Design a protein around this ligand. Structure first.
Ligand code: NA
Length: 810
């Protein structure tokens, strides 16, 4: 049972609006679904343009966006499955290009529906990503690359931005001028994204003029060159409005939704929102800009928001790059008790201004009450909802209504506990709490937190890579003070993940309760095991109010090891055959400053065991609002209430190139053996790593007179050469400099990389795709091309990722 959009007027690659034809095709699919058929809506492979003008329009109130604001209550939706079941939307590899401000696709009141096999983009994205390519502090100018997707007109020192236009009316969908309200910084050189001063864009401070240099480059002139702007070369400044007028995808009141094999190249307004939906599976989603664009923002805000859902939320085999908020947030909403009408009837209120106007309770749901101050449940407070009067989330009333989009009146099956009082207690819907399974994903290029999750059901975060999270890699809060986002946790497992280039704590557990309790804790039963943490000054774990917290069998490594062996005793020795000389070699092993790796704040029944700590890290524990009697380190080497620095005492090994000329024992005594010249090499072993140190050259004249590296594989993880030919100007490669940036008109290049240690593994990519690191002819696409070379030493632990970034000039 197949419905092709081609039979309803949507030709592939037509350049015409497909929105009316998709509506008709969905209509037919719904007819067949209502006959009991499993239906596929097929898109013959190609580009499809979907405009908002004729798209389905719905009044919708959406968690974590714009709250009750009536200016934005009406949503345009490009592909809407409503009130249906058993329908797969199969793009068959098509490219869907949306226009203006709209939601891309949605399912509402629908069961067993799937979206798969297409990309999602906008003609003119609403985040404007400007790369500074050159700055001239002497002339006080900067050269700014405006990606080809954007339209603009110049007027003196102003730039005016505009979208594309309606085919039906000629209306411009939106316009703006100069700096948009919010900006964040994607450093294309390092591949790190951070927030700085988000309300001050340095491209647009003290601009005196702008000139079009052609090829989509603008030369800005300034009355003064700030420090922020002087160091801006290679930075893509991602600027936008902050109003979340649309969800990017909306999955409201569904059951068994699957999204899979979708490339989200840009989402306007917000990310994928699940709301009051039972079971959503997300598999093989790639949020990120890719080859062929100079843009860098993929998400106007969050990528995945699961608000008040239930069943199982799965995110698997997916990748996340350059949102303007958290990649993943699974949570519910606390509503505050604002009126006790009777012992079985209360009014509750949406307290945060971006979440309001939709139902968080249906008849039959179970609720539980919480004391705001200590964020602990009221004992014996689970009740079943028997009646709901409040907003239905599409502008109408559930029950009698409440007279307000922020207020819901609940009737409960039995008298609530006497302790529950207005404004001191909140209510959580405990039916709409999901199990969470996030595994085999890649998170990078993110200015905020990687994963937020607050649910009482089973949570598994397993086998993910975190690189460059600007804030905590994993953040588990529970908040009835500012964000009003619910979910005390009861069963969390964080296992097999790798954290790299962490901008803050790798893992942060911090409910926002002001009052720290000695009887109970907010969260319980959290197990953090088998992860690898590369550390460089920030904590591994910062946990507040968790009981039965276990941290075991993890591996902690220095992210930037700097080891050597110095000599002092002359590096040049001449010997007579039979005589001996001793090397005065002393090992040098770098250590990581900053915080103790662990902090615990009001926790109970904490156990550390079986963890591996690299030399030179502060494997120690800070305690707050708790005693050491709640922390068990009997089976671990972490120290309570002390730094617990792992000693930086390296051992020294000695290997001669040619022992027929000169031999050496493991004390550093050279023995002249034969005539000739040879070099004896030192190596510093420090924990699981082995680095070379200074060498000694031995010259031995006539007279009448390796196995210490076994179990110590090499940790050399540098390149010795990196050549990129075919460019107007060449990079000045240095083994110690990882990151390079340039802009060039070249259409092709030849790249070759060589490891310092020929045994080390080199993995090279162009725009994420593997290339032959020994030598590859590469095509440079439109926009920003990124050649990455990752060298992994033979120890399997030490790696460096080099980046060569070229903006194409065309
Ligand atoms: Na419109």
């Amino acid at each position: 049972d197949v419905v092709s959009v081609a039979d309803y007027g949507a030709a592939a690659d037509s350049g015409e609006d497909s929105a009316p034809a998709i509506i008709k095709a969905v209509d037919k699919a719904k007819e067949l679904a209502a006959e009991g058929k499993n239906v596929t809506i097929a898109f013959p492979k190609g580009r499809y343009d979907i405009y908002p003008d004729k798209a389905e329009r719905r009044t919708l109130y959406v968690s974590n966006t714009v709250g009750t604001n009536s200016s934005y209550k009406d949503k345009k939706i490009g592909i809407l499955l409503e009130d249906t079941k058993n329908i797969t939307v199969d793009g068959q590899g098509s490219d869907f290009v949306f226009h203006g401000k709209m939601t891309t696709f949605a399912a509402i009141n629908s069961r067993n529906v799937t979206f798969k096999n297409f990309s999602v983009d906008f003609q003119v994205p609403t985040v404007i990503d400007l790369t500074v390519e050159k700055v001239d502090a002497g002339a006080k100018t900067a050269t700014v690359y405006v990606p080809e997707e954007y339209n603009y007109r110049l007027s003196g020192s102003n730039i005016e931005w505009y979208s594309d236009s309606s085919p039906y009316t000629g209306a411009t969908y939106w316009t703006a001028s100069n700096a948009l309200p919010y900006v964040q910084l994607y450093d294309t050189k390092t591949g790190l994204t951070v927030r700085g001063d988000v309300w001050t864009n340095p491209i647009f401070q003290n601009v005196t003029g702008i000139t079009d240099a052609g090829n989509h480059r603008l030369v800005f002139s300034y009355s003064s060159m700030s420090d922020k702007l002087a160091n801006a070369t290679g930075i893509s400044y991602q600027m936008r409005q902050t109003t979340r007028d649309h969800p990017g995808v909306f999955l409201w009141k569904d059951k068994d939704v699957t999204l899979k094999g979708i490339d989200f190249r840009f989402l306007h307004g917000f990310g994928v929102v699940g709301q009051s939906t039972d079971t959503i599976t997300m598999d093989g989603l790639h949020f990120g800009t890719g080859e062929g664009t100079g843009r860098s923002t993929a998400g106007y805000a969050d990528f995945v928001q699961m608000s008040g859902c239930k069943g199982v939320i799965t995110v698997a085999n997916s990748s996340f790059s350059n949102p303007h908020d958290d990649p993943i947030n699974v949570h519910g909403t606390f509503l505050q008790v604002v009126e006790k009408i009777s012992d079985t009837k209360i009014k509750v209120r949406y307290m945060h201004n971006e979440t309001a106007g939709f139902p968080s309770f249906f008849v039959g749901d179970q609720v539980e009450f919480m004391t705001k101050g200590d964020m602990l449940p009221v004992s014996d407070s689970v009740r079943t909802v028997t009646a709901v009067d409040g907003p239905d989330g599409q502008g109408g009333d559930m029950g009698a209504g409440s007279g307000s989009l922020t207020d819901i009146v609940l009737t409960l099956d039995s008298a609530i506990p006497s302790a529950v009082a207005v404004n001191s207690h909140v209510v959580e819907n405990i039916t709409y709490t999901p199990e969470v399974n996030i595994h085999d994903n890649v998170f990078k290029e993110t200015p905020t937190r990687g994963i937020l999750v607050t649910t009482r059901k089973k949570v598994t975060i397993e086998n993910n890579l975190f690189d460059g999270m600007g804030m905590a890699g994993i953040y588990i809060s529970n908040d009835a003070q500012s964000w009003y986002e619910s979910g005390p946790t009861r069963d969390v497992t964080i296992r097999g993940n790798t954290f790299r280039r962490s901008g803050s704590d790798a893992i942060l557990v911090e409910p926002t309760n002001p009052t720290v309790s000695t009887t109970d804790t907010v969260h319980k039963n959290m197990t953090i095991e088998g992860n690898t943490f590369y550390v460089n000054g920030n904590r591994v774990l910062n946990a507040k109010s968790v009981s039965d917290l276990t941290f075991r069998d993890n591996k902690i490594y220095r992210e930037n090891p700097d080891d050597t062996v110095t000599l002092g005793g002359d590096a040049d020795v001449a010997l007579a055959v039979g005589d001996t000389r001793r090397i005065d070699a002393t090992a040098s092993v770098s250590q990581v400053s900053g915080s103790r790796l662990f902090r615990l704040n009001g926790c109970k029944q904490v156990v550390f065991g079986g963890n591996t700590y690299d030399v030179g890290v502060k494997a120690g524990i800070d305690l707050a609002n708790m005693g050491a009697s709640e922390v068990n380190v009997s089976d671990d080497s972490a120290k309570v209430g002390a730094d617990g620095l792992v000693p930086v005492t390296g051992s020294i090994a000695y290997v001669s190139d040619d022992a027929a000329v000169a031999s050496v024992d493991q004390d550093g005594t050279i023995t002249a053996v034969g005539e000739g010249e040879t070099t004896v090499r030192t190596y510093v072993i420090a924990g699981a790593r082995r680095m070379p140190g200074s060498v000694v050259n031995v010259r031995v004249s006539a007279s009448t007179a390796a196995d210490p590296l076994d179990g110590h594989p090499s940790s050399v993880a540098t390149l010795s050469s990196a050549t990129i030919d075919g460019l107007s100007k060449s990079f000045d490669f240095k083994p110690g400099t990882l990151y390079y940036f340039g802009a060039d008109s070249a259409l092709t290049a030849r790249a070759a990389f060589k490891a310092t240690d020929a045994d080390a593994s080199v993995k090279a990519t162009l725009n994420g795709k593997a290339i032959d690191a020994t030598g590859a002819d590469v095509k440079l696409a439109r926009g920003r091309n990124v050649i990455e070379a990752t060298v992994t030493a033979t120890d399997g632990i030490t790696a460096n990722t080099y980046r060569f970034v070229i903006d194409r000039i065309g």
